[PDB]
Design a protein around this ligand. Structure first.
Ligand SMILES: NC(=O)c1ccc[n+]([C@@H]2O[C@H](COP(=O)([O-])OP(=O)(O)OC[C@H]3O[C@@H](n4cnc5c(N)ncnc54)[C@H](OP(=O)(O)O)[C@@H]3O)[C@@H](O)[C@H]2O)c1
Length: 416
């Protein structure tokens, strides 16, 4: 509807910058498989309640589809389809043998208990077994789905499969006790850190004691700031949550910021730092900028006032396309949000590899492998963005869609 057609429009805006076939563009627009299921559960009161579950596998030319599961009351098939179409290219940009998928249940998990959550997860797996699998479709954690739910669903899948294969590999984000992966907690942020270091290297600027402004202070934002300070030599000077923000040119301690927010519910009035708002945060003179909160933080109204040299879109959708154009014509190097947030997808791929191989990597090995994947993804995007003189998002889209086109042409799906 709205989101699916938005994804289709983004795909066409990418395709007009590359030599793709018309039949391939049409094939990419239509998701390969959509599964609607009536997921039944027995409520805690003894009644039976049926929810609507969606499993959309957008494409599997490059390999088994990889996609999250979302439990949000406002879910429609359009949102699932668009998101699946979108992490198709997420797994494409970072060179994974994956397709894109999305799972969803039209449900309000706020008033579902632990028993109800377990039953709903188990019943969703019972409904969507025939269309999933370790080599076919790998669900992953997403909004309102925590690794406890995935332990439950892996249990159900191994129960139904009778443990004939690598059950652990059917889904990702499982608890560390049963087929979990190290680096899953700090994954997206750490991959964003590798991309930030690579962008600084490409731009020609060194990160020793530079300035980074991080907007949004969820787990991802705190990890991004902490890892940037610890590794890159970043002197973070300002961080904001939804409620408010702080500024301190002397540098910040992300551990202290997290402690303050936990103690007081927000980062408001952190000691030693002036209280500022998010719009104050966006225009600050920093070297790196990283938005990690609600989508479309940067708008056309506040794009020409950005002074940061590098923008790392840690959060999804944070910059409007015309604001992206403004930042491009300002000499500001960006990082596409789906290219930036590819750390979680890369570590989920790593977890799947560990499950399939039966061998579990250390946090060290995971870190170096994520480093390699993230660096090659960013460098491919930047090199296409240099050769074709196109935007960051356009370059990443070109890389992803070119890979998917090559996968289909090799599979024979599209003869042209
Ligand atoms: N792109 C991908 O494919 C992919 C794959 C994996 C992960 N990811 C990313 O990584 C994140 C993984 O999700 P997450 O689980 O880490 O989100 P999270 O922020 O840890 O959410 C956990 C939720 O569980 C509840 N909770 C926490 N502790 C609890 C306790 N002791 N008892 C009861 N409830 C508790 C919390 O709400 P209450 O406290 O109110 O219950 C909270 O909302 C996602 O946000 C996603 O963006 C992405």
């Amino acid at each position: 509807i709205d989101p699916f057609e938005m994804a289709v429009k983004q795909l066409e805006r990418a395709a007009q910058y590359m030599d793709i076939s018309e039949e391939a563009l049409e094939w990419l627009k239509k998701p390969m498989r959509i599964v609607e299921v009536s997921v039944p559960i027995e409520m805690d009161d003894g009644s039976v309640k049926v929810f609507t579950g969606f499993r959309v596998q957008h494409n599997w030319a490059r390999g088994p589809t990889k996609g999250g599961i979302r439990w949000h009351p406002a879910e429609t098939l359009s949102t699932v389809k668009a998101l699946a179409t979108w992490m198709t290219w997420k797994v494409a940009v970072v060179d994974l043998p994956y397709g894109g998928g999305k799972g969803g249940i039209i449900v309000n998990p706020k008033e579902l208990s632990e028993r109800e959550q377990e039953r709903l997860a188990r019943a969703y797996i019972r409904a969507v077994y025939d269309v999933i699998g370790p080599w076919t479709d790998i669900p992953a954690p997403d909004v309102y789905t925590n690794p406890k739910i995935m332990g439950w669903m892996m249990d159900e899948y191994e129960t139904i499969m009778r443990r004939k294969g690598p059950a652990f590999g059917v889904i990702t984000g499982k608890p560390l006790s049963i087929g979990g992966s190290l680096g899953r907690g700090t994954a997206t942020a750490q991959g964003a850190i590798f991309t930030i270091r690579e962008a600084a290297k490409a731009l020609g600027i060194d990160l020793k004691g530079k300035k980074i402004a991080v907007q949004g202070y969820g787990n991802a934002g705190y990890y991004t700031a902490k890892l940037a300070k610890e590794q890159l030599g970043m002197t973070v000077v300002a961080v904001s949550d939804s409620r408010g923000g702080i500024y301190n040119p002397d540098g910040l301690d992300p551990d202290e910021v997290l402690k303050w927010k936990r103690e007081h519910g927000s980062v408001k009035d952190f000691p030693g730092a002036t209280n500022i708002t998010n719009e104050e945060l966006l225009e600050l003179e920093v070297d790196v900028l990283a938005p990690a909160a609600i989508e479309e933080v940067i708008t056309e109204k506040n794009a020409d006032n950005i002074k940061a040299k590098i923008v790392a879109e840690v959060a999804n959708g944070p910059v409007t396309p015309e604001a992206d154009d403004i930042l491009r014509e300002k000499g500001i190097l960006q990082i596409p949000d789906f290219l930036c947030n590819a750390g979680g997808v890369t570590v989920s791929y790593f977890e799947w590899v560990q499950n399939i191989n039966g061998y579990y990597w250390t946090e060290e090995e995971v870190r170096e492998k994520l480093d390699k994947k993230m660096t090659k993804a960013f460098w491919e995007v930047y090199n296409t963005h240099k050769d074709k003189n196109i935007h960051m998002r356009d370059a990443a889209y070109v890389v992803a869609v070119s890979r998917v086109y090559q996968a289909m042409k090799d599979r024979g799906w599209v003869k042209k």
